[PDB]
Subunit: 467 residues, 4 copies
């Protein structure tokens, strides 16, 4: 029973309650991609409203119906801050930080996944399509299948799927793999993730799998699980490109971008970073590179400025606190060394910026610095590109983002190679107008054609074909 | 020119000079495997004598001729402590510790590799066979080929070759890969390493490669490099099994093992660890597991004792210093909590133990704890097995060692799963005599048949076939 | 109202409840000194039973009546772990650790002090004598005077009173001083403490004070506070010397001391440390000194052994956790370097030892190592002396203990001067029998004559004279 | 022999060589006070030119003759960075940081002191007056007296002299005290320092001393040392007040102060800090206080700004590196939380500012924040006062500076009491014009009358009287 023929399930709702109450837009690219999707398409969205011990009364946000899931304080600590973001997040991002393996966290993760599955069953009509999202909910597909074998179940992982050598560290590796194999379709951004999953299915579970490489939105892999076949595919996520492109063309935004440059004392060049404050994002790398370019006199400290817009994220997790301390030290250091009173070389904001203000920064920025150590996709890169209909700008992009597989005309860097990052920043800052416009035209052709609608259609058509 | 038809090249000589002078046996399993080899087989051995600014006068150690390579203090700091053991070692072992990427270290690594290549050329006769060993010398095969295209060149990596996702971090990834591809044969312990290398050769270099899985000592892969073909294979290293087996049978060693038990106050059960003090070895894991078993009263603190024999290693490297501090804290902690005055539960020695004393500990030990987080092979596991001709004992072995692929009848553990480690230690401590003997007989059948002679013959026959 | 003519108030009761319930003897020298006192003398004892949220039902422990004070979990965290032991304790011991100044902790400290005052008033008969103990309760005398101006109130500080330059850091310096000035008599171990308090009363409060030096149990100072005069004195605390001396003579204890030496493999020399695991105690100093003597070959690692008996203390306070980690590291380090399997050079126990076992260790020990960085008195030094009626042994004693002012015939050291500590340990280990006996006879003459009865009589006679 | 009748000896020359060569003004208040002195008065100045392995060729800087002292790299590391600034500096400033006691450092300190003494003897004529400066050179007076008993020798300590309880930690306490007692006159900023020294002379040396309090520039103490009497006094150092006052009146400086306010976007209120980046200076305290006032909305983040001018100091000393990291973190943090792009709330410069630019900042600043945890005097406070002939401004001053004993009309704070610091900053920011001018007039009366000339005359008249 349940009234919805199409249900999305994620740890996040598109809204986030702030503590007296107040709704804000939820952070992260998962919401950035899925929100415009569910605003245009009928369907229900199940998720946590971002505070402990909330109501579970349905919330109507416009045309969209949200079903909130209650998490206790202990749930938030052990399932969300703990297993999800201090076990899985670091492990799947190439153990950039040492994962913590904790059995109590695992037990809570199982409990919460069960709660999400049950909530899904209550929302889902007979024979509904259910699309489960991301690493917090990897047990839900198997749990949901056991409760509701009538459902068609898709799972998409929004973060990298790590190499088998690292995944095998997880004490609950088999349970996680079994969880994912409960879906009819398991999707990843990149073929590499899909292939890691297929190999894992062979070694760990001993299931028969396809042995061919996986294509992009094509040439799907398969895993045989007794009576069932699980389809495996790569579907690189994107943004609502055309909408953002139109938004960035507004006179007010173009005016605001000019004002931002005026407020910065009309620099010749503005470099911009935009990220959650997360250790995967390489904010420390871009600051170090900028610092060394200033030290070497390869960037002019009088007419070049870097703006970093960092959103606070997962702040109770100790690794994130330590990262914040390190980034803020770099900011103070660089300004102390190269700034003047009344004129910093680095402007750093530790807050979410309103959407239209963010777009104005994209339009103002001569160089976009997107330097993650590892990122499943990175939508900030694609957002910048969509905003530059003027064909100005330059995107400096880490090759360890999923986006680099699509945005080859960007200035690609190995963020571990600081000399390469430094050389490339100089190249982007000094590019000719024609070379800049050539690259930006090429990037925009890709991003405008490969949008979130193409992504969702591809995944859901593949999911439907399992019926 | 040069007089030797067969030359081995490694950072280590089999001897190590201590600072007044004194020769000691060199540490590590590379010397453990290669020393008995070169004692029986004609050939020269090029390597560093373990001190800065040594002579380069040839050294005759028995029948064996050694050609020492001089390293300056800066060479030792930047090539050996730096690039080799603070860049490559952590990276190739699944970034257990964060690698440091430093261009000065790279430049020194290149310089030293060049020196080893030149030294090799001087020793090597026209058309000689040269066998280059391990991660410190990955540039030597290409360098040597350019100096001496008449030579047949083999390379063997004694440590894991990491997944492509991690290897690609290395700023000098291409130069390292090109270096290895200078060999006629590149060998790894395991098919997994060989397969990682083949994939890497495809993505990074763009060379045509075989696509099939690689066998054990068979079904070799190939990489096409313009005019040349490079063979790629898996050859799991081992020990001089029969010799060690005979050594362990000596009356004096059996008597010493009984005395060791007496000196420990005749415990019912002795657990033993033997390793270099290296963060890959999981000494912290086995101590934590023992501590928790004592806390839970699952091991009897009155009649069960753990002996850890740790060899100081790479002590100037800060990560190794921090590891030592942590291990020594665990030792003091556990004894403070569960020991009595005059009766520790953990005995910890931070020194190399003489060979016959080590063998006596192997014979005394009811349970061998070999719990690395990652190990290319681990010869300690195989040494224990070779020593237990009495068929007593139990081997607890991490699945993240190369040895686990051969020693399946051991008690295998995921060292990240502390509950699994704890449960398994209890199982080994309480095994029936018949189950213990069954496993030990099976392990010994494997280790006695698959010895260092089989390994070397397999590699060298494959190398010879490239002529 | 209240039934007792004599009431002692301290944060500790002589008993400590362990978490299922169980009574143990309370830690610390305050209980060591006051327990035998109150067992012989009529009177009530008010204090906290060592667990959160206890009953406040009166407890009869032998002839002694105890009135427990309830502390909530927050009280324990903010008043006891917080203000008392992370603000006052480090500050008064020469900021060995950085004090934390926290207003919430202060507010809780005030609240709890009020509760102790009220509890005291309920126990105290009209015109009773009340003796308030130590740094946790410095506000109680003023609070109690305001509730009960009929009472005669004494306060004794069991820890050092710091130099004015450090005391003045305290944001609540004036409130603390006013608190103490509520007493009729304020006592310290040493004239130096009394003199620091007098100076403080002059600068901080602006009260007229005596300007002369303060004597030992004589030549008291005075502070004029409007209508009242507060007497200030030095009264060095001690132990029940004669009782301990008789206890140590028992055949069983002498036999146990011989057995302990046998269990240690009959060493020629035993060094002993006995302390709470507290950063004031210099356990790290004595271990470093021992380590360096072994390294230098000035102590024989085959026949000399160090035993450290450390009682866990204030374990939730982070500074204490960090100290434990450091001490346990030193223990593991020293044994790894100089021990043999089956023969440590350091035996370390992290538990309270039963009294008769402790006495046996005192009797067994050739050298007693009492090396605090700062200690109000240190009763362990005096206990050792009382136990050695055989006149054997040697006391190595830091000059930064209050006991050093009385035990001048001990081997005094500056614990900050590691060479001095090392030289002195060698001197004590190699003393002639006659020199050892001469010193021990002199120390015992002092300790047997200056016992806890002399201390209490001196303080209480001075207090009575204020009536 | 030697040509000068008056010689000053200090670790610093008034000039500092930068590494290619370049002379800069030396840092610190010792040079700020002594430079104008020696520019007006005949005499020689012996000191180190701020680089290792310099010439010792005499340097003529204007009318002033400088005799440089050569220090080797090891001298700089062990005498200057080591004993002086990682042993004495933290110890004498109330062990704000844990002192390191190292015998090699002591031995180097002795050697270097000997070199300074010998250099002094070569410069000093028969019967000359020699004035030795500060904690780096405490052994020189005794050394110089032994070489040259004809000389009249003064010593002045520019940093606090710590309470006896802390000074006694020093393993070389007696040698240091003997060193100072080689002078005819030993001077300190404050009576408290002089009194600590007298007590120390009694306990440690056992010399007869005066027992009375010491006056300001009067009522001197005395220490009897066999045949000699050593005078002890308090002489609070100051600046060349009238000269600085006149300098600050220049039109260009007043214009620059207006421009600085314009460059900051014309804030209503500017707070200013000026210090060496030293852990004694409480830069962390003022930043924390500002941060919390912003969080609490007690300061307007739109029209109030803080400028911190920090001079890099002793940067190779690890404690100073850790301080820099912490301060720079606070700067980045506060701006990230409360700033806007193009508008920081904290401007931080990590460089020495030219004198006339510094004076312009003093004139611009509505509130001067001088919040040391401990400072011998602090001349920045007096400089600010001398600059405000307009009678504007407000000085917020830690009571743990020597200057607080003279500048009582400043807004005094206990920097450990963050609520007090916060309340006081608000009071200073919101003072009435008349109250501000009243305080500033009072402060200026003091500083203009009590200048460096009064200080030097007082010390030198006292020194002359010993002849
Ligand atoms: N400081 C910020 N202010 C406003 N929006 C931000 C900020 N940082 C990130 N975002 C937004 O969050 C989303 C990030 O998505 P993505 O780049 O895929 O990374 P992630 O999902 O890991 O957070 C983007 O839509 C991006 O514009
Ligand atoms: N504490 C020790 N004392 C004596 N020999 C040791 C000690 N620790 C390790 N060894 C020896 O060093 C060699 C280790 O080889 P292996 O297990 O392959 O690891 P690795 O090469 O990484 O050091 C073995 O021959 C082993 O017996
Ligand atoms: N490990 C221990 N086992 C048993 N008693 C101990 C232990 N450590 C200290 N004690 C006892 O605690 C008391 C310590 O008193 P004291 O030396 O004045 O120091 P403190 O009061 O600071 O703890 C002594 O009576 C001493 O014998
Ligand atoms: N950032 C700075 N730029 C220029 N001058 C500075 C700076 N910081 C401190 N000074 C100057 O250094 C001297 C500091 O003297 P003082 O306050 O007594 O402290 P200290 O001697 O401990 O450095 C002042 O003359 C002051 O103006
Ligand atoms: O939801 P947060 O923990 O605040 O992080 C925001 C988002 O970060 C990434 O995009 C994750 O893949 C999402 O699952 C997550 O929602
Ligand atoms: O040579 P060390 O740095 O002392 O380490 C000892 C050995 O450790 C491992 O076995 C390495 O694979 C060897 O290359 C190395 O020789
Ligand atoms: O009571 P604890 O915190 O366990 O410490 C034990 C004792 O240590 C010292 O002796 C203190 O002066 C006492 O007040 C305290 O009771
Ligand atoms: O000389 P620096 O180490 O650079 O420090 C600068 C100055 O700081 C303080 O003023 C000291 O009292 C001086 O002796 C010192 O010269």
């Amino acid at each position: 029973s349940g009234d919805s023929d199409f249900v999305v399930v994620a740890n996040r709702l598109p809204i986030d309650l702030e503590r007296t109450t107040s709704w804000k837009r939820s952070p992260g690219g998962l919401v950035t991609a899925l929100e415009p999707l569910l605003r245009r398409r009928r369907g229900a969205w199940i998720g946590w409203p971002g505070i402990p011990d909330s109501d579970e009364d349905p919330i109507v946000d416009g045309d969209l119906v949200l079903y909130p899931v209650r998490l206790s304080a202990d749930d938030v600590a052990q399932y969300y801050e703990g297993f999800s973001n201090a076990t899985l997040w670091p492990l799947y991002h190439d153990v950039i930080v040492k994962p913590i393996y904790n059995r109590q966290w695992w037990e809570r993760y199982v409990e919460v996944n069960r709660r999400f599955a049950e909530a899904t069953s209550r929302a889902a009509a007979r024979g509904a399509t259910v699309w489960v999202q991301d690493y917090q909910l990897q047990l839900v597909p198997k749990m949901l299948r056991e409760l509701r074998p009538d459902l068609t179940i898709g799972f998409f992982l929004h973060i990298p799927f790590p190499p088998v050598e690292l995944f095998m560290q997880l004490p609950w590796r088999t349970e996680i793999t079994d969880g994912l194999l409960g879906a009819d379709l398991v999707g990843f951004h990149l073929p590499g993730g899909a292939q890691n999953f297929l190999f894992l299915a062979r070694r760990l579970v001993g299931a028969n799998t396809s042995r061919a490489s996986v294509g992009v939105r094509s040439k799907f892999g398969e895993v045989q699980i007794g009576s069932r076949t699980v389809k495996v595919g790569a579907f690189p996520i994107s943004i609502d490109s055309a909408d953002l492109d139109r938004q960035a063309r507004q006179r007010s935004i173009r005016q605001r971008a000019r004002q931002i440059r005026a407020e910065l004392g009309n620099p010749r060049r503005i470099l911009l970073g935009v990220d959650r404050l997360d250790y995967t994002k390489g904010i420390d790398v871009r600051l170090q590179a900028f610092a060394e370019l200033l030290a070497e006199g390869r960037v002019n400290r009088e007419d070049t400025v870097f703006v970093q817009l960092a959103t606070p994220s997962r702040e109770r997790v100790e690794a994130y606190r330590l990262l914040r301390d390190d980034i803020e030290r770099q900011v103070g250091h660089i300004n102390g060394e190269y700034g003047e009173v009344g004129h910093p070389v680095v402007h750093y904001l530790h807050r979410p910026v309103p959407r239209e203000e963010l777009i104005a920064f994209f339009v103002a920025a001569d160089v976009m610095l997107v330097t993650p150590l590892r990122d499943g996709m990175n939508l900030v890169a694609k957002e910048y590109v969509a905003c530059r209909s003027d064909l100005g700008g330059a995107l400096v992009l880490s090759e360890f983002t999923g986006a680099a597989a699509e945005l080859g005309q960007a200035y690609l860097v190995n963020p571990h190679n600081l000399d390469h990052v430094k050389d490339t920043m100089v190249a982007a800052l000094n590019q000719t107008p024609e070379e800049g416009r050539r690259r930006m035209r090429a990037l925009r052709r890709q991003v405008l054609a490969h949008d979130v609608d193409l992504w969702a259609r591809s995944f859901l058509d593949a999911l439907a074909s399992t019926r």
